[PDB]
Design a protein around this ligand. Sequence first.
Ligand SMILES: *Cc1c(COP(=O)(O)O)cnc(C)c1O
Ligand SMILES: *Cc1c(COP(=O)(O)O)cnc(C)c1O
Ligand SMILES: CC(=O)N[C@@H]1O[C@H](CO)[C@@H](O)[C@H](O)[C@H]1O
Ligand SMILES: CC(=O)N[C@@H]1O[C@H](CO)[C@@H](O)[C@H](O)[C@H]1O
Lengths: 792, 793
Amino acid sequence: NVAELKKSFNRHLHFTLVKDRNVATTRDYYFALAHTVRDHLVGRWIRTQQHYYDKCPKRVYYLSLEFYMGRTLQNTMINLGLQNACDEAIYQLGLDIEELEEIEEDAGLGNGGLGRLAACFLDSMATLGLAAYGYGIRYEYGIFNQKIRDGWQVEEADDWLRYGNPWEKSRPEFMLPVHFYGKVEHTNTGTKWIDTQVVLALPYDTPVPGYMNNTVNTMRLWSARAPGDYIQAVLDRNLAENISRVLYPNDNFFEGKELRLKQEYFVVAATLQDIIRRFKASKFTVFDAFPDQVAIQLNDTHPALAIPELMRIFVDIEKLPWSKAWELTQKTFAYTNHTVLPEALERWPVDLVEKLLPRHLEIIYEINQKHLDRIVALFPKDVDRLRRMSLIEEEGSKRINMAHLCIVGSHAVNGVAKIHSDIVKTKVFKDFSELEPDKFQNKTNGITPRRWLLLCNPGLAELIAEKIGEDYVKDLSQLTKLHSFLGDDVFLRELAKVKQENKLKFSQFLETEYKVKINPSSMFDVQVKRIHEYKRQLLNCLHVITMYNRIKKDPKKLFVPRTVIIGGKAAPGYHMAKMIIKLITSVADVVNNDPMVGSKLKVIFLENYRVSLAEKVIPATDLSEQISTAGTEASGTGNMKFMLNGALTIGTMDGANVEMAEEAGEENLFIFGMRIDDVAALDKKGYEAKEYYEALPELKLVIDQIDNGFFSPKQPDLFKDIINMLFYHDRFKVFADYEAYVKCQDKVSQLYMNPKAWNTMVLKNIAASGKFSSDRTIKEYAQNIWNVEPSD
Amino acid sequence: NVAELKKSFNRHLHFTLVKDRNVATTRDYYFALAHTVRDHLVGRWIRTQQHYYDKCPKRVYYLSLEFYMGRTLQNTMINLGLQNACDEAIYQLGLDIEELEEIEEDAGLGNGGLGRLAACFLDSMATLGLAAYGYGIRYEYGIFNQKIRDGWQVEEADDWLRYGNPWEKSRPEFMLPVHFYGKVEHTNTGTKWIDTQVVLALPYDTPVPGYMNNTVNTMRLWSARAPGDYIQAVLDRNLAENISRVLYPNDNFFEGKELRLKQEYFVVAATLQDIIRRFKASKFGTVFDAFPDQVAIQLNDTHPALAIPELMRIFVDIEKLPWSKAWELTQKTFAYTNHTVLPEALERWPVDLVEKLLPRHLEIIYEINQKHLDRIVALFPKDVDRLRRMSLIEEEGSKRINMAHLCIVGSHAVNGVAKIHSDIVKTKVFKDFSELEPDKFQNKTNGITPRRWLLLCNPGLAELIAEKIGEDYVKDLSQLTKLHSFLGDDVFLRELAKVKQENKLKFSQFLETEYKVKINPSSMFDVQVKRIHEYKRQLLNCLHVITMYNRIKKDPKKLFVPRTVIIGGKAAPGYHMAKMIIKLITSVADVVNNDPMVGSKLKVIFLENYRVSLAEKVIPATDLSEQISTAGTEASGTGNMKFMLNGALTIGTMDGANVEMAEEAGEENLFIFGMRIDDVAALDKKGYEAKEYYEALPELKLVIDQIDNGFFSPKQPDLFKDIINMLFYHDRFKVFADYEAYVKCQDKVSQLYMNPKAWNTMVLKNIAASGKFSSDRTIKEYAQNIWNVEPSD
Ligand SMILES: *Cc1c(COP(=O)(O)O)cnc(C)c1O
Ligand SMILES: *Cc1c(COP(=O)(O)O)cnc(C)c1O
Ligand SMILES: CC(=O)N[C@@H]1O[C@H](CO)[C@@H](O)[C@H](O)[C@H]1O
Ligand SMILES: CC(=O)N[C@@H]1O[C@H](CO)[C@@H](O)[C@H](O)[C@H]1O
């Protein structure tokens, strides 16, 4: 009750923060409330873990280098059914819970979709009652804080643990040693990796509360600690601890740095030991049942080294015969592929691996040897097949194809969207899937309806609950029941009203953050995600300029006002992406300050886009931009978040976009541009950018405007690199989709002119978004890959 | 009551540790109990701080680079009066209180006596109800952990915060920026220190509970945090945070490293800002006229010397006060404590280094110096040497700043730590200065807290005394003189000795389990524990051990008082001699300990990893305390006081506080020997010829040749060449010059040890006269004659 929550809060403020109400700070209150909320998890956390030991169900281990978790407080309050009461207690204490909630640092230990999927999964798995564990690195610094200086992205260290994290519990008794470098000996008592360097792995446990269900699972993040001149030797301890120091800020791009390889082995070695530990300590030659008790999901190839590591443990330590160890290994691992771009592919140079992980390279060679021995046996005269299927790339400086390793060391390989999984199976890994068709499957991504609905959009969640009950929260497929209210004008009005309140709250945020007067009744056109060429924020920028020009040539023409928001972080070393940011801020400066356009159109670059900000901007969106070149977005997930929160989608037939269309009906989505096939034919025929440039007046003007310095007077050639790429090196064919895009955009504004018809489509969307719950995704994984059963 | 303490303990284990009794670990329990104990401090902590704001009494600020605090749990339980109840609750919960307590990591943010004095002071000041604050650095790594490998000291990182510290509370809202480097700008708006590098200073507060008195003061320790290639730039953040990373392991030795200078400015800048900020927020542009009446900053040796030019910098560059005023307020604010006379310990920073790190401060230091010498010239026109002798700058060769001179001129009071010491500091070392201002120089004999050094480390003795004279002595140690009434009490003397016996037995067990050696429980425990240093003469002790060993061989049947000689202490990592002397002791130990001839007649142990928590163990179990520093080298000493309070007799020179212990207990009740400060001066004049004693004393010569010929290092006959060479041609501490008197003195000790009744009689005379050495007395004198603050009860 309220009375007791206030007692607890005041107790923590007193004993935990050691503060008086007259000298407490907002951070003091936030921490007090956080502890008060955490205390309500303890019982179920301890109980849940105990229960797994007692009933010994098969455990699922999600191994990933990233966990884009965002904030915890509110998510915990909601999942525990404590939000309303905490809200009231904090209120009665003369405080604003929303003010306390903003003090919390995001746990941005991720780059984007890949890291956010793990976070959503952790939520679903706990909600479905699975004995699941999240394993990753406790980066001292997550994804950098993006600031905008003179229109350019600037990075600042994300010191998220500076003031402490009340949601974690260090478990020193489970500390483990990790080995790096050294050499290998093949003694008569088994082979031995000796003269290695050791780095301790200290685990920190974070509670993962299921939604209203008695389950609180665990997320275990490891921290690196260290085991001439004295002072210097002490300072040098920083080198070992530098391993879990900061997250590599790359999204869909492989950067073969040695430190990154260390991070990868670090988490893979600490996790496997811990897993083997817990197994050999369970109630249960003993390892014969390992695969029936353990399931390790490989989040992309980053934790690929987990395969040769398990084998290493099985053979070098447990002394099992290779045959057995290898059989158990394949049964233990499952690999998820989320890559398409060739630059995202992880190909480690054998020289680097040999120097850091000598024993693992040997194991990888062995796996490869036995692997190709099989192909040769099956396809004798196929010599190319061998080099095409080898885990080693001999071409020039030899490199290890981590994906091939994952495919051979796993009993299941999956894509993240029908379209994606199909290309992965039939195209990218045809040689492999041909041998074992059954191994390759699909698992369309999903998002958690808790954080992405109940939490970020209470108004909508409430509206829906009032009309169909709260069952939808644990079974989102229940949203189809909203189809009964299609002809309900009072409901459509309520729906729109909810969206209006969202836009207003967010508009305030914008006005206070940026010096710009937002038009509360304008259509909110939002494209938020990591800045990437394949994502085409550039394409969007051409439409904004294209829109601006139209306003000048006819400032009196009836126009649907718009507030175009574009946000996203750029990898620090991604030049183009950083150039595209400058362009947007540049175009924004002109548009936003032209007295001619005035309140007809406003452009904002949403700074520091992250999970907590996404929860703010998504619920306030009218139009969601998902315009990646066909075949480039494996699936996407932000797309699903917009659809669930009442936004219409303008996008290509790419990733999950295709499935959202299947569910809601293509006509209820603004699909445009060329499809995967058209992109192939254009590739064959060849891509001549200038053609569209000369063929389309609207475009040409936009381009020349960009090229001539219209958006950068003091630096006319500022966007030279962009213009050059656009014309001679655009793999994502921006101009090839410009016409269809702008045409599509016009149709959007048209429908926006008919409120009743717009909210009708919106409803058709929300009502058909159930499929995209990460609860459905996890059920399919558990059923067809992990072989585990859910409980309640 | 017990019932409630058990409730809280179980609540913390559950909610704070998130653990079940079936999976909890000992550390889990230790942390649970710690939190349970901390909770009982909160009210008084919050209340005490509030009270200072309300009644605004003058605040004392102890600025030091070291705070050797040891463990907190038990000390907190005792001071709060919760030990019994906590003891009770943990017992009923079926847990071993001793096992939980030994879990606690030592807070060794100090090197030895200088850092331990601050820790003791914090305790007294809180016990006396003073509005005092301790300010220092929160080193991630304190004094290294010493291990012994192949008889050699080995250092291991002291990762004391690895599992967390339940006694601290980070206060981020009080975070401050510190500046380094940059350049000085001389404009019309004045002087602007521009283009500096910034390092954040994050404070962590630790409660300092007074003994049974409602007061809980604060110890504020600062942590450094940071404000091309991205990843690399992030990793490079380690450079700023490296400032508060580890404590420099030097004792009585100056190591002019730039990082150390950074640590020194870091703590001095964060502290002054914080002090100035609390002053403005107090109830007193801004008016600082009353600053000195509200603030007192005690400089613990010259390490935080930069605090002077920094206050001036703040006063002038920021607050815009006129130099005249700022300088007047500054002197009234600062007081400086001189802790040593060892030239090699003297802090003399090269002006080039300071100029590059703290450009503005060098200017301020020059200004201070200019105005300073301007005064001397006015008073002593024809005295040109006096000028260079009194200058804050040493122009001799590479110019250096004499931090001590700076402290003397920027303080209204300068003090030594023992009568003998303070006298040399005043009349000799700084005669030129004291001559000008006699009244500025004073003495404040050191003291130790009777809480941690009696009640905590020696419950049996504390209890015995309480049973005979009441517990008033704990807050007024002078009450120990009441124990003189039991001089002719044979039953009491027997009880006293018994207490000591139980101590020796408990510790003997420790030794047997730690080291593979059979200790003789009835042997006299000869202990010399302190930092390894030549001036301290552990080497002298080693010659007596060898001298003793040789006697046992030439007559294994001679009636002999058995002994267990223990020698412990850490050596500064880069201190060669000290590390050689350690090897010698372990070497001599190996021979003696394994000679079937000597057997249980004599055993030698090198107490590994000597630290505060171990000192609490070995001191109460000591019969003979070795305080044999060369006359004039130990400013005061404090371990000496700890032994005296715990029932050990003292064998030592007339040095430091040894002289005062003698005054109190009576010289005849102390085993004083060797030459005194004067004799050392005459020998210096006459010159020191080591070989003389070597050739003049057979016992010695044999010892030496034994050492020199490889008797103690067969596989390496010349191993101790450097030692032998120093002993003969470069021994500034005249080890041979005191060898005869020393060994003679040692014999007298064994003699008295043969008469139990007469030995415990002297011991009683010692314990009964140790009251003066309570840090409660020391702090009272500081408050009274330096800080001008009144105690609150
Ligand atoms: C959901 C989410 C993403 C993934 O978005 P896409 O548009 O699918 O790339 C990226 N960043 C954040 C902060 C997210 O919440
Ligand atoms: C008291 C104490 C000292 C001081 O010893 P002296 O022999 O007086 O130099 C040094 N270290 C520790 C651990 C102490 O407790
Ligand atoms: C390498 C990588 O980060 N892939 C990303 O993964 C997420 C989650 O699978 C997909 O939705 C998205 O399309 C894709 O860009
Ligand atoms: C510089 C330094 O560490 N000096 C030491 O200070 C302590 C505390 O005052 C004295 O007891 C001791 O004699 C002296 O050696």
